[model samples]
Target: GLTEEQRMMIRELMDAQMKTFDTTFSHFKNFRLPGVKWSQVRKDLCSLKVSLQLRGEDGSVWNYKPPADSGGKEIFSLLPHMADMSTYMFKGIISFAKVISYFRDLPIEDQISLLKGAAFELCQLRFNTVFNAETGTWECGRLSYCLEDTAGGFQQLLLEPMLKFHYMLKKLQLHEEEYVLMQAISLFSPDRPGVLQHRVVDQLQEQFAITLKSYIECNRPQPAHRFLFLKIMAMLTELRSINAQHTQRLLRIQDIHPFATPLMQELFGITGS
Candidate 1:
């Protein structure tokens, strides 16, 4: 039921954002946080407003605009999500792990190690879910997921992504560089419009969206989840103060996890305590 002119406007806007998202993905993978200030996100939303303002556009699209003078409160809906996203993306990498049977075969200790490896290896992700309370409708925000990690809190941000690199190498798989490229391209679906060429922007938006979804989906438990996230954050902090080569070695061994001896050694070097 949409008119051609209205459709054209929507495409143009979506295309612009999509191109931005692709570029964002690269920045996210390298541990560089996509510093899209709150203002830019707000600007993007405002663009949404303009899209529907076209003379022939239907009134149905305007259903969610809050009162004209709502001001900052108008952003209340998005703020909680912003806080939640920042925390969730920093929380874990296991969400990216591949499923494996006989996970129990490894000692409880080593099992944990492999899980960490899987998570870190493929931690870069882009995910999203949008809920429209007014219309009781949910939609995926356009360019909402970052196909890579943008959380600066990650320890060895470059190294973490590299953990899976050595593991893949031993398995006769791709090197870290190639794997990184593969992940960067694959998770980003082909459906993205004009912005596909702008890889950095797209990746940033994608990762940012994934972070936002974590809280919307469920509660975050401690130790098993929260503790690990905090540890990664701590590692990032320490990296700034010390030259830590051993830490990188430990991270690499953990990724190709076939034994517990390496992990046992790591437990002893737990300097964060």
Candidate 2:
């Protein structure tokens, strides 16, 4: 039903970003935030575009109520093992290098806001690299993640949406530049509620978005693929949906979460008041 030729694009970007972070944050575990309690930081809430988001709440609810038996620690039980991938992938995204090149123009407040809001979504896109679509497994290094791995740990509703999103995008065949640029665009999204310079961030997002458009136009000029630009942007919207569910589950049990500690600076940005 499908026909095309694109080769090894995701691997290139994943490793490229990973290598940079390896060099940049060699002593990563010791890293610490600037003693900044969340109260000291500004707030950030992004308003979502009302396109396909309201497709009747048939399945968007987070229905997993952790029984007292498991201690509410692993609502998404497969998460700890999967977090092995995140350990590397999150660093790869942080060491994206463009943060200094472009976002430096924004103040520290907005920089932290933007990074915190989009980090999980960014990792979602970045992890798209290791998703072996045909096999339906996220083949990270030697570890493989499958939807079946969720077992009795979650409300099966969440797994289907995640699997579908993964397969759909890996089907898109994004190149390194487009993939990297998508993360950039995700970072600068201005709709996040508390960003101070909304106009400035919006402008930055537009510029990067336009850059992606022209790149796709010049490089992927297939008539059938003419709308990859729209398609790719649509994935950003799709990502928010999945990430919203993700945020909900994590926030609900964060108080006693085994690993959802304050150490996750990016997640804490959203988790804290």
Candidate 3:
């Protein structure tokens, strides 16, 4: 439970941080993400008679293409690896950083613990913002990518429930503000195993919940949608499932490709230990 003043302060803090996130991660909306296409960029590499260089975790430049005698399969196999890492580095790291700053008042260990536990959920939230309900896919530029579109058919099973969850969220047609508030509310969870100040974190989450309820009641005054808060909060179960699937995927990726970018290693908890 929070005092009225405490609730107001929390709301203001969230609103300011939300503004910062929009400015920092506007690419979630713009979709100008990094990464090169193996097939498409292969053409450019050959036409220009040059190699495409990518930076590694140790600050080393690696050639994108293998020797012609070595065959192109290697590059093709690396495509999904690069794409997944790029997306995580771009969106996951930045979003995690923003949230860390938002909770900077907490002890450093608590901040890291919260991020380790919740960053994936926050990442998924932003990652799916551009999800197209009708198409049941992520709207990335010209092509909308589905959950099952990953390499080696690894994501097929995991993404089925995720797609259904996305469909439900999209059907709700929440205002952008409400979605953003929900994202904050979802990530500031205090029940994560390592949180040192669970009481403080719980209070913060409660503030967001109260603020969201007030926002819904004030802006969306419809008797039929009275349970909107419950509906939105219920999605946390689906989000937890999605995050679990994400962890398994990252672990699998590590098993296949041990060397990951530093940002990825930290953000995704791929310590490889």
Candidate 4:
């Protein structure tokens, strides 16, 4: 537990640092942190499985390892190959989780306002990371805006397309443009081409508009966009079987599937990506 004065000082320190607001702002909000506590903040560093390296004004580099438990071991056991730190997305989760936890504690209007900000920030992150062929997915090997290194961990961004799919399927029959968008979105899922044939054909048409086969012929490029493309497809395609294993309540929104709903039910809850 932190003393009141300690919390105040730490809060002030965090506030000062947050004034710059580049990437850490979301993290500040995520923990639903009110006033800061030195001990608590230090503890959080450990919870994130992160160790900071600081350089003093004197130009000395110091290792700032968060205190460890009695085992005397680093918390993250999976280091050196844990994908980059940026991909951990601690900030996004901290902010969103904090807001959700706080919504019931705050007045209605305050909850609404915070929700709006969360939504807007989410949109910005999605738009920046998810783009068309020429750009080839920003920060390809770097962390996702939400900190998921694997394609499936990008749940916040995936929510948008999945929600839209639920809406469109309920409201209208699939058309070419709609099918195109669904496949484009489902490309993020790990489903097979045969499963979503209509949408896949639609997506193929869009790819062709940019001279698809010719582009493939001209760009014998090494493993570039291929990784991201395959990873997303793999995740989406598996959604049905992966999600079917659990009850609906236990499943996350991103894990749901549009097709094979019946097959998924019959498989004793073995849903896929």
Q: Is candidate 1 or candidate 3 better by TM-score?
A: 3
- Hey, what RMSD does candidate 4 come out at? 20.1
**Off by more than 4 A, model 4:** 1-47, 70-220, 230-273
Quote the positional error of residue 23 for candidate 1 in Å.
18
141-167 per-residue lDDT for model 2 (tens digits): 323344333334334423466656777
TM-score of each: 0.21, 0.66, 0.65, 0.21
Indicate which candidate wins on TM-score. Answer: 2
Model 3 Cα lDDT, one tens digit per residue, 5-30: 64565465456446444432324332
TM-score for candidate 1, residues paired by index: 0.21
For model 3, the stretches where C-alpha displacement exceeds 4 angstroms are 1-102, 140-159
Q: Pick the candidate with the highest lDDT.
A: 3
| Cα-based lDDT for every prediction | 0.30, 0.58, 0.59, 0.31
Residue 188, candidate 3: C-alpha displacement in angstroms: 1.3
C-alpha lDDT of residue 18 in model 1 = 43
Tens-place lDDT digits, model 1, residues 74-159:
42343333323332332322222222212222245443444332222232222211222222222232213211223442233324
The lDDT, on a scale of 0 to 1, for candidate 1 is 0.30
Residue 66, candidate 2: C-alpha displacement in angstroms: 17
- In candidate 4, clashing pairs total 33
lDDT accuracy of residue 203 in candidate 3: 88
